[PDB]
Amino acid sequence: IGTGFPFDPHYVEVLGERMHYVDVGPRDGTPVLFLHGNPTSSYVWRNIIPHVAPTHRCIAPDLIGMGKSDKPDLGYFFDDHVRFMDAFIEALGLEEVVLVIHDWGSALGFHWAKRNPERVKGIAFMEFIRPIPTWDEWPEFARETFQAFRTTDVGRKLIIDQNVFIEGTLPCGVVRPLTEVEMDHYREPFLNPVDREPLWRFPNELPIAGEPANIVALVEEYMDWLHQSPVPKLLFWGTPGVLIPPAEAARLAKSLPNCKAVDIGPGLNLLQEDNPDLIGSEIARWLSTLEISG
Ligand SMILES: CCCCCCOCCOCCOCCn1cc(CN(Cc2c[nH]nn2)Cc2cn[nH]n2)nn1
Ligand SMILES: [Cl-]
């Protein structure tokens, strides 16, 4: 599994800030937009993009406050990420897109799709944000940690002062051991403790046990839209998963229209780090089938 990040930096100005993105592949055709989540960056897509770049433009931004994107003094609410991602997409002048989305990247991508349904030609997704009705529906091994994350004093001490989301939670989201080179890539944007605000706000935005109520409502609405939409769908899942256990992936594979589901084997949250070749190869082949009438 490759540790390098061999992508030239591209930058675009967005609402007075600068955002970084990977941009490879041909200039024409429908672009494939890759959206990472917490606590990653476009680095998480590094071994998936090469399977897709021969046939499609691949665009992989770093969320505001993350990766190589700028770090304004925001709260980094989900609302803030929505604002910047909306403006990022318009700044590149994208028209129709295929979405490849993960974790908080999936909340951004589904929320954007719901509002721009004519511009989404397909959605590939994995370990994505859905409403978690009670804490019993959160994986037992991660319950006490995320419950502590969702406090102001203790959670900020863990995530901001002690960098637990990077040093502890992140490697706990991968079945295989991350190498020191891979850890340093994930560590790079957050070496300065003050810059770890998004890492703490994100778990406090998670729609768990009905709170925060604004995020729960928004996530419910895009899951409603997703069950209504004929858009082609590709769902990757692993065992045991974190956000999406296998029983839930099996349920969604039938309840979502026009949905193909792919078992990646063992996996927790960063499925991309456990089986990038399967995910990248299946995305590339699925993209081809989107051009077949039938
Ligand atoms: C869905 C969004 C992305 C999901 C990412 C993948 O999710 C995997 C789930 O990961 C759960 C495990 O989390 C990290 C495990 N872990 C435990 C500790 C030990 N202490 C944490 C703690 C304290 N009290 N309780 N816990 C650190 C400490 C120092 N001083 N005081 N405490 N460090 N790390
Ligand atoms: Cl999170």
Author numbering: 4 to 297
Quote the original article:
To selectively tag the Cu(I)-binding catalyst on the protein of interest, we employed two different methods for protein modification using genetic tag proteins. One method used the HaloTag,14−16 which can be selectively conjugated with chloroalkane-conjugated ligands. Therefore, we developed the “GEN-Click” system, which can target the copper(I)-catalyzed azide/alkyne cycloaddition reaction catalysts proximal to the protein of interest and can be genetically expressed in a live cell.
To test our GEN-Click approach using HaloTag, we synthesized a chloroalkane-based HaloTag ligand (HTL) conjugated to a BTTA moiety connected by poly(ethylene glycol) (PEG) linkers of various lengths (BTTA-PEGn-HTL). Our BTTA-PEG-HTL ligands exhibited favorable HaloTag binding properties, as confirmed in a competitive binding assay. However, the BTTA-HTL ligand did not show high CuAAC catalytic activity for azidocoumarin and propargyl alcohol as a substrate when bound to HaloTag, despite showing good catalytic activity in the free form. Our crystal data suggest that the specific surface residues of HaloTag strongly inhibit copper complexation of BTTA via π–π or hydrogen-bonding events at the surface. As expected, HaloTag-TM expressing cells showed no desthiobiotin-alkyne labeling with BTTA-HTL.
